[PDB]
């Protein structure tokens, strides 16, 4: 079952009501539940300017305590490709700026509807190129690596994709991702409502981000069905028991294991999709990124 | 774990080379392994030709020991729409009249790779329209349903959509049906080697049938994301537990439900995908036949 | 999910107060609970005393319409060793006795608290022993099978033990059976509340059948432990998808099955425990009846 | 599936013969395959004489190269209450120490058969017991937790539950833990053969460490049928998806949310039971290190 504390928490009302308001609306409430966590210090944080092939990029810089050279992880922030922001993952940010020992930088990609898919994917993706070859102006030497929660997740395993042959990247770190169009596993019709993120929501999510049907089989929004999956980076995927979108981050791992690459995947137990954004309530949150904090001190550090 | 029976005969070689062989030869094959069962006698069996939009159909039409009045069912076999036909699934169409006391009018819808999707939903459709306005050829007035297996399980999903609001089907069996594509559930990632229908099957048999990828998002082979469930007819829907296949059609099972037709969505349990074709061998296949009976009989004559 | 039809039931208070209300209490609402659904006709019922070792044993005889001769099906009720009884089984018994032509007997065996266990067992195989031993009576010389539900099945499956090397027992059937002690499966502890049959229920009827701790390390409490499970009957085993119960049936599937013992296990999906016992209102009940139809006609007659 | 690293190994013959050879024999099989992990450098090792209630009992005490103050984390070897020691855990040990910046105090508590239940139990609980009133001899101030794998998680759980209310535990990891007797589990059923840890073993380990059969209703056995479970230490509970052990150990953490302690819980999945022992060659083995790292620093330091 649920973790009581988060039973608790969804009795009460903790909704955003995707596809029951105005898109401006649903951005307020989810950056007023997300933002009232902790911004917890860090050393330095600067916002930048990313030059894009289609926009200027905005970005979040976040600079360790700890002394450099640092790795840079690339941080995407969920939403369901429409809501969310940078300001809005900043408390999320941070804590995990201060796990990891590293620079983060958190990309405002474009949003849904205002600009529909491939626009976010473009936007992930020249910004960690940008990063990548930027990676001095952060001492970043020690590598670069890409994150993301949810819709995130979905932007971070494309953008690994994307980077194949072109860009070195360290690590991927997929938390509770959605990786393609999914209408068949037990966990999407088990836990389509009722968690959180619902069926609905998704349905609408993909309403407004997806051109036409044709989309679904785009390996940019699939990468489930991505033709080979070989010599992608180590990945870290996260799925919690109770979301909608656990089997299908359980798949995906299992294809890039069977694609001989690494990959540690963990399911959180008792709680929900989103429930990094919630980790001052929910403590299984904190422990996620302690877990994400460990796996990139490794892989860049060579650090416990 | 399987049944240990089953586990001696998938330890012995009981395979069919589906991609690893000709198309040709694995038919021959599968036609020697499903041929060879017993076939119980019936009252009487008859080969027709059905006038279909594109082409004349074969039907054999089995007729049972019983007096009518009978309902009849349209069986559609299963093969991957590859292979499979009337002649190798005779045995279990046999079986399955004699346990519903009813017509069975088993279809040799059009294969691939010789003719593509949609030819076999066609036929299927065709023939399952034309059964309904001749069912007094068949002293087959307690009128009409539908069932396959396998990919005739798909078809037989895909023509009960079609039929609505046209044809008064009264039920639909699904054994195992493919409901469309899915890269993301459990038992597909999970039973993808070792349980006798593989992923790699499942991948060549639609690379056989569909025309291009757009295919997939036809509901003519994805009912499961069809528009509107409502309406159609009451279903028995049947999974194996090491079926790569089993969670798709028990998804499908959740959606019919929460449309609002009822379903009776059974797991057979220890067993493999197929398990009807080999009831000599697997008791349980048996006892699966008999629970068509069962709903035969009740939704055609009020009869236990 | 559940079937819709029985959220709806659930949410409208479809409860037995067990442990919430006195013990006369809770057996008057189960029998108008169970007893309210139709009773269908049978050729001849006949109410019977048999000699026990430690009572006399009342029984109820339901003969089919068909003509003999018969198998006979001894049937032990559910109801947690504590409720339930011949006459609120009448009608599930009657469905029975149609569905598979053959006489039942159903048992009414003795009641904790009043009578600890092992009384409900030794009444059972009693029963069992002395219906094999006077099969004559009944124009049922095609043999003996047990079956139960619950309660009754954990019974059946005791018997079925026992009976080795005494009985032939030519079936069991275990209809969403109770096979030990269970602190540790997923679907017990997943399904604990909401799904009818919960977990403060099941300590309930624990607390009052069992004399000490103990006794759950008895064979005749718990099956699933017993040394030697081959050479036992050939099974059906019926478990519900949202059952406490369902895990550990499933696991005494397995068992048999690695002895050697022919099961048949099959999960009714999107259903409750007790759910043939709601036969009116809950389709896939009937369908469950027409199952152990088929494999009792099977077995009994050699007929489909 | 398996990572295919794993699947890899176990194909290889990477077996312990339990229950197949002498207990010497099987003893030397494990400490050759766990004590040939690389042993990481740490600021100091002592081994120490705790005095016991029953015996002098021997540990080896971690100190890392951290500065003061520390806490204490006692850990409890597995190997089926049979085998291990504190020499053959001294890699995965040091592993922990430099994960977690903490002192680790290693227990070699008495084995069976020579030593058969509670006795490990009493000299775990006699053993932290010192150590919580000897925290001072190790700078370890910053108070005491408790971990251990498999059989030793066990004995972890089982000090959890006798220190209420006389020891201040921080913290209780348990890894892959058994939490008694488990004959209904689904995991139990299906992983039982193939996965390094065997249904087989576990019969067998019981058989040397159990003294009767009532000892299984014990709670210093199994600790999932303890009457109270709240006021336990906060929990760490790490379960490996094809591990028999998975289900019971999910279990019992649902048991301690149920009880108000807060528990995070998380499978890792694609690996066996015992893959941290395994740490050089399974990767997700060094995460789930990382893992007890960040929960130890948060716990003892407030620290990322
Ligand atoms: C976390 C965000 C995940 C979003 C996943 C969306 C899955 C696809 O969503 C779908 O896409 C289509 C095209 O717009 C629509 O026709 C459908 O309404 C919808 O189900
Ligand atoms: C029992 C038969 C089920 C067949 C299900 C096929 C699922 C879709 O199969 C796919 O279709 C595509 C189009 O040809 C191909 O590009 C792919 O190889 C394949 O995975
Ligand atoms: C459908 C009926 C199933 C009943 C299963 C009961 C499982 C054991 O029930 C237990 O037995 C003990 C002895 O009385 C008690 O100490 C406990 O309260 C209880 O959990
Ligand atoms: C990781 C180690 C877990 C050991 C769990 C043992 C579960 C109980 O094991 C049992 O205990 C009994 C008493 O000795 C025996 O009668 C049985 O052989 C055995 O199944």
């Known amino acids: 079952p649920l973790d009581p504390r988060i039973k608790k928490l969804l009795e009460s009302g903790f909704v955003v009501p995707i596809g029951k308001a105005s898109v401006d609306e649903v951005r307020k409430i989810f950056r007023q539940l997300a933002s009232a966590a902790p911004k917890a210090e860090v050393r330095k944080v600067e916002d930048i300017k990313i030059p894009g092939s289609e926009t200027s990029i905005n970005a979040r810089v976040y600079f360790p305590k700890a002394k450099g050279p640092y790795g840079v992880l690339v941080y995407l922030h969920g939403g369901g490709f429409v809501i969310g ?17 590293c620079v983060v930088v958190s990309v405002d990609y474009r949003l849904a509807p205002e600009y529909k898919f491939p626009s976010a994917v473009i936007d992930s993706f020249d910004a960690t190129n940008w990063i990548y070859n930027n990676l001095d102006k952060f001492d970043g030497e020690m590598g670069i690596a890409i994150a993301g929660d949810s819709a995130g997740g ?24 959605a990786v393609g169009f999914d209408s068949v596993s037990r966990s999407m019709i088990e ?7 619902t069926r609905e929501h998704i349905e609408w999510f993909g309403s407004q981000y997806l051109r036409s049907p044709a989309d679904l089989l785009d390996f940019r929004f699939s990468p489930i069905i991505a033709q080979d999956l070989s010599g992608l980076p180590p990945a870290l995927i996260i799925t919690a028991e109770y979301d909608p979108l656990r089997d299908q981050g359980e798949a995906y791992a299992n294809r890039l294991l069977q694609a001989g690459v690494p990959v540690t995947s ?5 709680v929900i999709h989103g429930f990094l954004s919630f980790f001052p309530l929910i403590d299984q949150g904190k422990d996620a990124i302690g877990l994400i904090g460990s796996v990139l001190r490794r892989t ?5």
């Not at 836990?191 to 993120?197: I, P």
């Not at 963990?266 to 008792?270: A, C, E, K, Q």
């Not at 860049?300 to 416990?304: A, G, P």
């Open 191 to 197: 836990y389509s409502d009722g968690f959180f993120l």
């Open 266 to 270: 963990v399911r959180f137990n008792n």
């Open 300 to 304: 860049f550090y060579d650090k416990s």
């Open 154 to 177: 979905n932007l971070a395993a494309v953008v690994a994709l994307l980077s194949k042959g072109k860009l070195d990247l360290k690590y991927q770190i997929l938390i509770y991702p």
């Open 85 to 101: 922001d940078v300001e809005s993952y900043d408390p999320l940010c941070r804590a995990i700026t201060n796990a990891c020992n």
